[PDB]
Amino acid sequence: YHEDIHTYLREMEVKCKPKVGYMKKQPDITNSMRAILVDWLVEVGEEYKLQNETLHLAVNYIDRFLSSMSVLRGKLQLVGTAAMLLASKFEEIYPPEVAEFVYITDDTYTKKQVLRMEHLVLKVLTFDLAAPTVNQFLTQYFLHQQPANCKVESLAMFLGELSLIDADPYLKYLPSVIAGAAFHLALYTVTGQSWPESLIRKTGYTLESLKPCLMDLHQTYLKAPQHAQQSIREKYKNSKYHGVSLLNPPETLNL
């Protein structure tokens, strides 16, 4: 059922893909505001021991809700909090209580407001909360690597996390393509190897097909230390992820 699961994920990621360039239609919020919101969500997920998939799902819900709806400056953090609550309810075994999210928002929004925005986000998404993320495709690709290197997987998670901060240009790539680019970049960074032929057959993504997203991800990785938002770099500094954020990015991708 593994290949069937991957095929279903590929079919469903197009349905769950947010509209590209929705920030232009946003009257108030911009790409930088979304980056700050995603960074704050990374901090929240680290504080509450939330899984990486929870944060990926929260980012996906935020992107879809902003594609289908417009919110002001003050409601962007409420939207992010409601999306994080929904993702925790969907993915986590014990989602944090609504009071915890109200607390972590610095008491900006009351519990009633958080619950109302949760209802609104659920209605807008039409309860389509099982959105494929970069994490799922990355794990699926991990089952297709030999030998399994924990550094490769940790760096691929780090790069997929980095791809969440910048809507430009990672909103124009499907999660499968971003995951493939992250996997190849991690393999080249820590092992000096390329995108595997087994994954070429499984995904249909040749190394040429990932080249645009690969260049974008290499540019993000090189400029990661100088990026305005650094919570992902701090999170992956921990020995749990083998300190992959400490590794220097390769200067050039031999393609």
């Binding site: 700050i36 919101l37 504080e47 962007l76 953090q77 972590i104 900006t108």
Partner: peptide
């Protein structure tokens, strides 16, 4: 810390 009001 994580507790912070964004976009003040």
């Amino acid at each position: 810390k994580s507790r912070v009001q964004l976009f003040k």
